[PDB]
């Protein structure tokens, strides 16, 4: 089984997490997340899973 051509999906999106509209644990949550992007582990998780 293979992807289409190169594999560009043609629909562009990334995963997201819900929060109560009123809730903003996310603005605070965001900061932790980026460094996580920057951190090598995302790629470890990539390699992991």
């Amino acid at each position: 089984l293979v992807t289409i051509g190169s594999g560009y999906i043609f629909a562009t999106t990334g995963y997201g997490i819900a929060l109560q509209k009123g809730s903003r644990w996310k603005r605070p949550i965001d900061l932790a997340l980026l460094q996580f992007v920057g951190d090598g582990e995302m790629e470890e998780l990539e390699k992991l899973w």
């Binding site: 293979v2 995963y15 997201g16 819900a18 929060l19 109560q20 965001d30 998780l45 899973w49």
Partner: protein
């Protein structure tokens, strides 16, 4: 060896909020029983501690398998998981306990236990998987986010504007799009144009 009943007849008692030993649970034979599956919250909610959250299970983000019932325990590098055994018609929510969860989201959640320092409760959705909107009322994890059953919903869920009016996400961790997997082949044209 204490001359005591071999199978202890035991009951679990919690020191209650107002000087009371509310019956936390009872112990019968080998099995351990707690009357309330959910963990009680002391006083007022503090620090969004143990916020309820259900993460959708899929190959990409989370994965569920049974706990090692031979030991009665969940795998060390996984997370012990719960769900509500379906009983929609029934008054009871139902209990779908003892299932372990895997995946990088699960691992991120571990990162988050430490990072945002917040305890969490995780369960599985029953009606509709990823939110489905039909007529007046929406369905899925989004429903439990709207109903106040769930604070945050986690999974392979895609982002859309409608979800955006209702709720929000600031992460965008992985690149995903609609796609097709085909078994296909390519072939020579004009025998290298006869050289």
């Amino acid at each position: 060896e204490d001359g005591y009943q071999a199978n202890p007849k035991l009951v679990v008692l919690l020191l209650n909020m107002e000087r009371e030993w509310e019956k936390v649970g009872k112990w019968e034979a080998k099995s351990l029983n707690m009357k309330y599956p959910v963990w009680p919250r002391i006083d007022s909610d503090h620090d969004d501690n143990h916020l309820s959250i259900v993460t959708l299970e899929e190959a990409p983000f989370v994965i569920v398998e049974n706990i090692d019932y031979l030991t009665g325990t969940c795998v060390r590098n996984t997370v012990p998981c719960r769900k509500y055994f379906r009983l929609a018609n029934s008054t009871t929510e139902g209990t779908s306990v003892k299932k372990c969860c895997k995946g990088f989201c699960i691992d991120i959640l571990k990162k988050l236990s430490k990072t945002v320092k917040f305890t969490y409760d995780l369960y599985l959705v029953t009606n509709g998987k990823h939110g489905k909107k039909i007529k007046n009322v929406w369905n899925g994890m989004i429903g439990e986010v709207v109903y106040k059953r769930a604070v945050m919903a986690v999974g392979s869920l895609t982002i859309n504007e409608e979800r955006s009016v209702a709720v929000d996400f600031s992460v965008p961790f992985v690149e995903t799009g609609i796609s097709v997997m085909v078994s296909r082949s390519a072939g020579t044209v004009s025998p290298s144009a006869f050289l």
